[PDB]
């Protein structure tokens, strides 16, 4: 059921506002005798929510009101001079960002907030949608105020059943993300026929629009099937197009379920990680 242009724009804008809500900066290169006041004076045009100045290291950890203030402070003071010291002003390299994948595609942004909110205060929380249809890609990102919150979330969500799905959780480097890199190049195929042993017929079926660069069945050290397959396509547009025609397609008397993987890793890394997660949980 196709979404009206107003709903598509509403979803994509919410995801864009959420993705851009990075308001924590890190200042390095401060003079040895710097004071808290000097840092407050430097950033007097902005509203400081938090400011810790480490006098022993020449660094400051500052939380500004929003992402717009953070970018403005960065542009204004990155590589500027403070009493002849060159300053580095960059987004804080926090480690509290998770990708929650294999979500039901019907799961709403509100339901995704309800799922990830009990573990702590959220800095960023958004589903990733198709730019063309506005439909959810079945994965989202949650960034907490604290790393301990994200660890607690990953522990409770990794291998959690939600509808006809088992969620996957992957720690993501906030620094490695861009709006383009939010769109996954990997697909996950499950609902294979029982005792499926024809990988070639699977890669061909999944080659109907675009040819995958990677296509392997998941299997343990003893070679036995783990229940799924991982595929990789050259681009995000190619993976999205392949997923659209292949999802629900009949193969060997079974209607395949084709989903998106967490957007970061290549096929080989994704396949090993998904096998590892399931094995750890079963044993």
């Amino acid at each position: 059921h196709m979404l009206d242009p107003e709903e598509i724009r509403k979803r994509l804008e919410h995801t864009e506002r959420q993705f851009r809500n990075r308001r924590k900066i890190l200042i390095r290169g401060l003079p040895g005798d710097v004071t808290n006041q000097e840092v407050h004076d430097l950033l007097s045009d902005y509203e400081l929510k938090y400011c810790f100045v480490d006098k022993y290291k020449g660094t400051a950890f500052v939380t500004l009101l929003n992402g717009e203030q953070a970018e403005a402070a960065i542009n204004a003071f990155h590589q500027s001079r403070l009493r002849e010291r060159e300053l580095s002003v960059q987004l804080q390299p926090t480690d509290a960002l998770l990708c929650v994948a294999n979500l039901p595609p019907s799961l709403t942004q509100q339901q995704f907030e309800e799922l990830v909110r009990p573990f702590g205060s959220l800095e960023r929380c958004f589903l990733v949608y198709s730019e063309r249809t506005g439909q959810s890609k079945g994965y989202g990102f949650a960034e907490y105020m604290k790393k301990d919150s994200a660890a607690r979330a990953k522990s409770d969500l990794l291998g959690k059943p939600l509808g006809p799905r088992t969620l996957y959780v992957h720690w993501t480097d906030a620094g490695q993300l861009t709006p383009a890199l939010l769109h996954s190049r990997c697909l996950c195929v499950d609902r294979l026929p029982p005792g499926f042993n024809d990988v070639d017929a699977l890669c061909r079926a999944l080659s109907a629009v675009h040819s995958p660069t990677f296509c392997q069945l998941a299997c343990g050290q003893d070679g036995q099937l783990k229940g799924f397959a991982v595929l990789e396509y050259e681009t995000a547009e190619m993976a999205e197009e392949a997923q659209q025609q292949a999802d629900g397609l009949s193969l060997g008397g079974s209607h395949l379920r084709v989903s998106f993987c967490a957007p970061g890793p290549p096929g080989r890394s994704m396949l090993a990680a998904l096998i590892a997660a399931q094995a750890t949980a079963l044993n």
């Binding site: 339901q111 009990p118 573990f119 702590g120 409770d156 959690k160 229940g227 949980a281």
Partner: protein
């Protein structure tokens, strides 16, 4: 080596709770851990009610152990309900778990009744059989209430307040793919 005679209805009720609880990991879920002990205790009860050496004292203690594990399931379910933002789930959870202490008190009383009969020889077969039936009905009610609590606590896990206090972990012990 020697397959002990059991009460099949109390064993089937125990096995049904065990099936339900082993769908989940016990790590970060003390309800699941307690539910798993209740099932193995209820499986011991299916052997105890058939009589034998020292079964009087054993049956009384087994119902006390089941009641202690029940108390824990109820304590934990009330901690989950206190963090739940959905009125319907919160109400179901509190309703479905407040009956558990009542059923376990009746199980301790019904265990003592049957235990006192195992220790005697002047009790009629009809009386002995109905004392077992009462334990059967109680055990079925208790295993059902614990399955219901486990289902409502799990349904609540996605309806918890922001930055909550107490939460339970719901991670499957069954294959992840379809």
């Amino acid at each position: 080596p020697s397959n002990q005679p059991v009460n099949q209805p109390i064993l089937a009720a125990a096995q049904s709770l065990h099936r339900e609880a082993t769908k989940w990991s016990s790590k970060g879920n003390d309800i699941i851990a307690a539910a798993k002990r209740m099932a193995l205790l209820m499986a011991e009860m299916s052997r105890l009610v058939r009589g034998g050496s020292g079964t009087k004292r054993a049956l009384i203690q087994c119902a006390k152990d089941i009641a202690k594990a029940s108390d824990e399931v109820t304590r934990l379910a009330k901690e989950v309900a206190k963090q739940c933002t959905d009125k319907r789930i919160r109400t179901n959870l509190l309703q479905v778990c407040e009956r558990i202490p009542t059923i376990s008190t009746q199980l301790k009383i019904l265990s003592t009744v049957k235990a006192t009969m195992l220790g005697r020889t002047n009790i009629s077969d009809e009386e002995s059989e109905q004392a077992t039936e009462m334990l059967v009905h109680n055990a079925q009610n208790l295993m059902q209430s614990v399955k219901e609590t486990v289902r409502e606590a799990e349904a609540a896990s996605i309806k918890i307040r922001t930055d909550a206090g107490f939460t339970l972990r719901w991670v499957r012990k069954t294959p992840w793919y379809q």
